[PDB]
Amino acid sequence: FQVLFVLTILTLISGTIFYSTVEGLRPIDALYFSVVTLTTVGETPPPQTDFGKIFTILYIFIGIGLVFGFIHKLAVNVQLPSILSNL
């Protein structure tokens, strides 16, 4: 749980630094982009540079599998007993 959390955070900071610099976004926006992209929500306009597109493509292939491993444990290995056992 701790390990997947670390990998997820590191993946998110890479994305924040990438998009803040190459796409010119304010860090809160580059984090938001990173997050809604790896979670496949996507409620954003696409990157506008060719370098942003290519990176986004590679980021999704590598990052999705991690982010979603993390979310299974987050809900299904921490919220579950918490919530379930009250019941």
Residues that bind Cs ion (CB under 5 A): 42
CA dist., res. 67 & res. 25, Å (int) = 22
Q: Between the CA of residue 53 and those of 7, 29, 50, what are the distances in Å? A: 23, 16, 5
User: Using CB distances below 5 to 8 A depending on partner kind, what does residue 27 bind out of a copy of itself, Cs ion, none?
Assistant: none
Helices 2-22 and 50-74: crossing angle in degrees, nearest 10, is: 160
User: Using CB distances below 5 to 8 A depending on partner kind, what does residue 22 bind out of a copy of itself, Cs ion, none?
Assistant: none
Residues contributing to the site for a copy of itself (CB under 8 A): 3, 7, 28-29, 31-32, 35-37, 39-46, 50, 53-54, 56-57, 60-62, 64-66, 69, 71-72, 74-76, 79, 83-84, 87
**Residue 44 C-beta: closest distance to Cs ion, Å:** 8
What one-letter code names the amino acid at 19?
Answer: Y
